[PDB]
Design a protein around this ligand. Sequence first.
Ligand SMILES: C[C@H]1O[C@@H](n2cnc3c(N)ncnc32)[C@H](O)[C@@H]1O
Ligand SMILES: C[C@H]1O[C@@H](n2cnc3c(N)ncnc32)[C@H](O)[C@@H]1O
Ligand SMILES: C[C@H]1O[C@@H](n2cnc3c(N)ncnc32)[C@H](O)[C@@H]1O
Ligand SMILES: [Mg+2]
Ligand SMILES: [Mg+2]
Ligand SMILES: [Mg+2]
Ligand code: NA
Ligand code: NA
Ligand code: NA
Lengths: 188, 188, 188
Amino acid sequence: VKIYTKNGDKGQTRIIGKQILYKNDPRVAAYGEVDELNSWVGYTKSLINSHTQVLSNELEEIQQLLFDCGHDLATPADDERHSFKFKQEQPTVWLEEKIDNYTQVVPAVKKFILPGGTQLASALHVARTITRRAERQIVQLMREEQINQDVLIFINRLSDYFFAAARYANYLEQQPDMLYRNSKDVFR
Amino acid sequence: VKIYTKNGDKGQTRIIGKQILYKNDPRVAAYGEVDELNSWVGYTKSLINSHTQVLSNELEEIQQLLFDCGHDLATPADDERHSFKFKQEQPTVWLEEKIDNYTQVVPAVKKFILPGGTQLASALHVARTITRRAERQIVQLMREEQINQDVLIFINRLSDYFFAAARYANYLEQQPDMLYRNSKDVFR
Amino acid sequence: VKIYTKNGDKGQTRIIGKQILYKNDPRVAAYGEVDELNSWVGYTKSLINSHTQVLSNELEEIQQLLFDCGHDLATPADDERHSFKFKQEQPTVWLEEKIDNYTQVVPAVKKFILPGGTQLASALHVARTITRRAERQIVQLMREEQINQDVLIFINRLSDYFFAAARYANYLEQQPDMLYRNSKDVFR
Ligand SMILES: C[C@H]1O[C@@H](n2cnc3c(N)ncnc32)[C@H](O)[C@@H]1O
Ligand SMILES: C[C@H]1O[C@@H](n2cnc3c(N)ncnc32)[C@H](O)[C@@H]1O
Ligand SMILES: C[C@H]1O[C@@H](n2cnc3c(N)ncnc32)[C@H](O)[C@@H]1O
Ligand SMILES: [Mg+2]
Ligand SMILES: [Mg+2]
Ligand SMILES: [Mg+2]
Ligand code: NA
Ligand code: NA
Ligand code: NA
């Protein structure tokens, strides 16, 4: 088995189905950014400690879901031989329940917080912002091609999950969040 | 409080003031990249150790400043109800004084260095390059819309700060920098 | 020595040779993304432990090679005073030999794996995906300007190297890889 085929050496790559695209095509960029997020989630999970073990399984579950999203991003809406398989309903509800629970448990803020704290909380803020970068890429693709809009819904919700989980990670080690000193009351 | 409004689920988001933009709009991308930098700075600060404690407070101060920059990037120059609040003078002087001090104290190089060393020094090099990525985004926005040019000045200077601070972090643990083996003398 | 010249404060920067470009120009973006990768490789190397010491030297060698690639990306193909110096043959063979060896030694998969595991393996997956992001940037530049195509070949191969090395890092700590649960058999 050779994972290097060399077929990409001139700048084109195969997507799902027959088409080849330049590697900078917005479709390739979209699922490539999802893959970068997925790798960062793996890195974040590797930082789990005894205080934060309760977050481990759901990070692995998110990795599984990000593969399901990437599949659909790699699939043209008019490819007769392949169809969209990601459905947002249940995964997105699942994220919302976590967001509600973690928002309830941590100390309430009205103001923006500095993205930081523990190493794990900080990594969850990095995940938050890479998710949002991948979301931008997905919207770029959406403006040119038909996509599975359920992926967008889920990826939008996912960055709120990472915010909530980052605060929960600080709570699990009793690290206080720090406020942005010039913040207005923005959370209502 | 629900941080998930779902109003972003179709790919548009609210900026400062009345306007909504696509999430891939260059303005949204610019302050989104600043937020990614800010999160990375949080992560970097979480790596502080007893040798490097002297760097902790100024990283937190940079996080505060990055919120002030992001505010102005999110604000249209013609929005009557909101105005630019970031002024570069004092923060940028403050960075320059750190850059001068840290450049003086560490072993002099003429050649490019490998970006690495200690975990903290390496993270400061990652911060250096994410700052430069955010700067590119800010210039993309500048070419289409009027911006607070003071944010650009500060963000330019900030990546030189991260270079200087990365070298200082290696110095604080007595980790030598490594040279790029084919470098010309580039620092003059 | 002042690394801050302030000449970049209005959004333009000097490349190799006489030209100045906007900081968001695709050329500047391409070698800037290579620099971000290089910094991440430095960070990854800082995570080496006693189990993974055998990977340290080759990560440093990759950093040297990434400077050689960045040089050529910063050099216009028609700049009479500067020429391309990167040749892919030997570095790319060297990567392929590592990929072959590491593919042979680790447990065989047919299915996609979750990008994660140990902290080092996870960082090598982050390197994999940042390499692929830089590759996209390089292809963007290739579509507008003549480049040294040897850089593209090497950067393509490099992300397969990081995949193989990430799996090898997990093997070195006897951390099993996890499969994507809905994967088809994709590695043939
Ligand atoms: C909190 C604020 O963050 C901005 N916002 C919403 N989604 C994204 C994204 N994917 N990338 C960057 N910024 C975003 C909007 O301005 C929203 O109101
Ligand atoms: C050191 C060199 O790095 C380049 N340079 C300057 N600013 C940036 C940036 N934001 N992103 C990437 N590269 C940049 C220019 O080529 C400068 O001369
Ligand atoms: C494994 C699959 O990953 C995609 N692919 C190939 N190169 C890149 C890149 N630089 N960025 C993102 N995705 C890429 C193609 O779809 C290939 O078949
Ligand atoms: Mg959102
Ligand atoms: Mg600069
Ligand atoms: Mg490839
Ligand atoms: Na490959
Ligand atoms: Na939200
Ligand atoms: Na400089």
